[PDB]
Design an enzyme around this catalytic site. Sequence first.
Site, PDB file in Angstrom:
ATOM      1  N   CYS A  75     -21.806  34.181  -8.916  1.00  0.00           N
ATOM      2  CA  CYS A  75     -21.512  34.745  -7.653  1.00  0.00           C
ATOM      3  C   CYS A  75     -22.344  34.302  -6.549  1.00  0.00           C
ATOM      4  O   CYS A  75     -23.455  34.154  -6.660  1.00  0.00           O
ATOM      5  CB  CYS A  75     -21.846  36.415  -7.858  1.00  0.00           C
ATOM      6  N   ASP A 119     -20.629  35.446 -13.700  1.00  0.00           N
ATOM      7  CA  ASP A 119     -19.202  36.276 -13.428  1.00  0.00           C
ATOM      8  C   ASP A 119     -18.321  35.541 -14.471  1.00  0.00           C
ATOM      9  O   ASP A 119     -18.328  34.286 -14.698  1.00  0.00           O
ATOM     10  CB  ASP A 119     -18.520  36.105 -12.002  1.00  0.00           C
TER      11      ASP A 119
END
EC number: 1.7.1.13
Lengths: 259, 259
Positions: free
Chosen positions: B166, B173
């Site tokens: 991220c 992620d």
Amino acid sequence: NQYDPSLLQPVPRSLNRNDLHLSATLPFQGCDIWTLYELSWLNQKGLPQVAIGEVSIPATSANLIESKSFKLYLNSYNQTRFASWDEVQTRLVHDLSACAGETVTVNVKSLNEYTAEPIVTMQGECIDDQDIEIANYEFDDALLQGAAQGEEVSEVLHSHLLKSNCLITNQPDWGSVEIAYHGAKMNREALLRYLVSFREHNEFHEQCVERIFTDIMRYCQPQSLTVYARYTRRGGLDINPFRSSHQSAPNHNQRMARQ
Amino acid sequence: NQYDPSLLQPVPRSLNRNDLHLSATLPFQGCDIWTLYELSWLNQKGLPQVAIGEVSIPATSANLIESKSFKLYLNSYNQTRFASWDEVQTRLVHDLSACAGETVTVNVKSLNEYTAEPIVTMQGECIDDQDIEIANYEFDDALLQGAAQGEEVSEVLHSHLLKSNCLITNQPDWGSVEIAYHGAKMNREALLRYLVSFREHNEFHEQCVERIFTDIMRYCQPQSLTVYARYTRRGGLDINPFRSSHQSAPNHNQRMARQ
Ligand SMILES: Nc1ccnc(=O)[nH]1
Ligand SMILES: Nc1ccnc(=O)[nH]1
Ligand SMILES: [Cl-]
């Protein structure tokens, strides 16, 4: 970025249980079941591998594992090569067992093992469909005072309405809880209100299930009791504490709708 | 603690797409599908209600919604009374539509609607079972250069190995991505390596699916293409961007193993 068993952090179970005024001889048995949704490492050629882990820690262990440490520790696998999946499972078993202080079981499951697995509900009757006006969102254990005043029954009741703030982050932690008991009939309004009174209160998962257990035993005095909560994940991990006067673990670790 | 539509925060889709060098006339259509796992409010008597929301935002909308704002905005429902579930759905539709700038659809589903729903896999053939040595974890779009050199085929390929940090938090992620195409056969080693090269790179979900789309179209020039990623949740919300040269949305929003 490389695998580091030194990242884990234990928390003595005794602190919390010294607060529920609980002895060196336990009123409950059971376990803390965790699901590790984002478990990933590299194979010996550097290609990522992904799996779901399912962990069970005995409730009798000296420590539980500090959640944020559990999370960094899993992270350290992400860029580390291991030659096989069993190597990975061996490491998880050893480190989590060493941290908690009692053998912890660990399954490492490949994602295809989840294909077509159904979402499950809890056992028993949901009590959340009540037309009662809600008073508290501040905690009150004495909400169970006088709640058990019936015929001796065998019931299982559950609610999806358990919520409390994390002691640390103060964001909400969401859960469903399943209460199986034999003893005088529990008033469902009282029990629902008791559960709802956690909403704005600060609590820890394991601590929470143990408090619900000891308050019900105190106030309602069933012959036997099991409390099982299943929380939604935070940072890739969920916690599912199970505490019983007779059963040592639930039958499976199947996920519920919100998990 | 009370419901506040002013909490949401839009992000112009144009910023990211100005970076993929994309025009005012779009090469793709589709949508961003979100699952809201921890949607909760109070009924008119103050009793908590819980549901799962499923949201679809058009890819043509001017804005997407800043994730951390989406999260605080959902939080504001938690201690607010609403007289009925439809009231809640109406508010979600309006606010998310106003934020994104185009009608957004919203289903608010009770948890029992998930009982016995199966975990699904993706369509097509998984490409992650390759015995290749991995080089990069730094991004390189030119990994697809020369990747399409075959007979014209119709295939669907998928991988569970997509991961990126991220931009904000730099935690990983996690996602699975499904690539359906008709055109010269894509080399699976190249494609897998391309996907893996996201690992240590900083990316945003919607941005990610759009980049995979435009790079494949650029490098491999299929006649038609669909890219669909399904990410695991953060803070109770998951994002599932779908981008296609011909299809406007996937057939369902069923969850995968890690989600
Ligand atoms: N920080 C933590 C929260 C919940 N459970 C734990 O074991 N640790
Ligand atoms: N911050 C965000 C991350 C991913 N998607 C969004 O829409 N916003
Ligand atoms: Cl999270």
